[PDB]
Amino acid sequence: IVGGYTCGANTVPYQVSLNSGYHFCGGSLINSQWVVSAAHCYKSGIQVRLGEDNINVVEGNEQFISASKSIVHPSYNSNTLNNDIMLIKLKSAASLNSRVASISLPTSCASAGTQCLISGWGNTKSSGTSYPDVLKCLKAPILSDSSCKSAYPGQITSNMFCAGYLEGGKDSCQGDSGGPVVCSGKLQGIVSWGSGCAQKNKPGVYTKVCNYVSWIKQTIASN
Ligand SMILES: [Ca+2]
């Protein structure tokens, strides 16, 4: 997250870190057994880390649970990132508590203009590289479809939305991929892509989770 703030330990209790020997992507706990992330964060051998604040110190509220299954969307296209969503099943259910909690899936899609909370352990520099240890947060508004398509001509599908600041300076970034965009208390986006991070006229692009709720529900009903 570039231009964000330190969230505060366990104040984003549905945020997970995906670990394959190191943190590589975020995700969102949607019930005790399932995490939603980005399909471009697929790796074999994922361990889900819940209750994290500092990802490099065991502070006492973590649960580390191996994934048993990952399910990339059936229509994921890794070239365009259309349908950039994946489900990860935990080998064992998380113990839900004040620091490890699920986020609701949406009933309706979020509105342009809505300020959402984006979080993660990704890079905090627009130019250069610095990865935080503790979870960072950003409030960013959803941008109109026409603004998003003007920023990325011929690249935005109906399964993507933009959020952020066209003047630059505030955005998600590498290493935040897969993590949540929460708007009015529901998971509305997944950190997916953008041109650089926090560059002028190049806002973040997010997977539109409200288009996937039927797939998520039927998949979790089946696995
Ligand atoms: Ca930790």
Curated annotation (Swiss-Prot):
GO biological process annotation, one example: proteolysis
Molecular function GO labels: endopeptidase activity; metal ion binding; serine-type endopeptidase activity; serpin family protein binding
Disulfide bridges in this chain: C7-C137, C25-C41, C109-C210, C116-C183, C148-C162, C173-C197
Annotated catalytic residues: H40 (charge relay system), D84 (charge relay system), S177 (charge relay system)
Residues in Peptidase S1 domain copies: 1-221
Major localization listed first in the record, in broad terms: secreted
Intracellular or extracellular location(s): Secreted, Extracellular space
Residues the record lists as binding Ca(2+): E52, N54, V57, E62
Regulation: Is inhibited by scorpion cyclotide trypsin inhibitor TopI1.
Catalytic activity from the UniProt record: Preferential cleavage: Arg-|-Xaa, Lys-|-Xaa
InterPro entries: Peptidase_S1_PA, Peptidase_S1_PA_chymotrypsin, Peptidase_S1A, Serine_Proteases_S1, Trypsin_dom, TRYPSIN_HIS, TRYPSIN_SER
Chain positions recorded as substrate binding sites: D171, S172, Q174, G175, S177
PTM section of the record: Subsequent cleavage after Lys-125 leads to alpha-trypsin. Further cleavage after Lys-170 yields pseudotrypsin. A cleavage may also occur after Arg-99.
Keywords: Calcium, Digestion, Disulfide bond, Hydrolase, Metal-binding, Protease, Secreted, Serine protease, Signal, Zymogen
Tissue specificity of this protein: Synthesized in the acinar cells of the pancreas.
Cofactor(s) in the UniProt record: Ca(2+)
Name under which the protein is recorded: Serine protease 1
Organism: Bos taurus
Lineage of the species this protein comes from: Eukaryota, Metazoa, Chordata, Craniata, Vertebrata
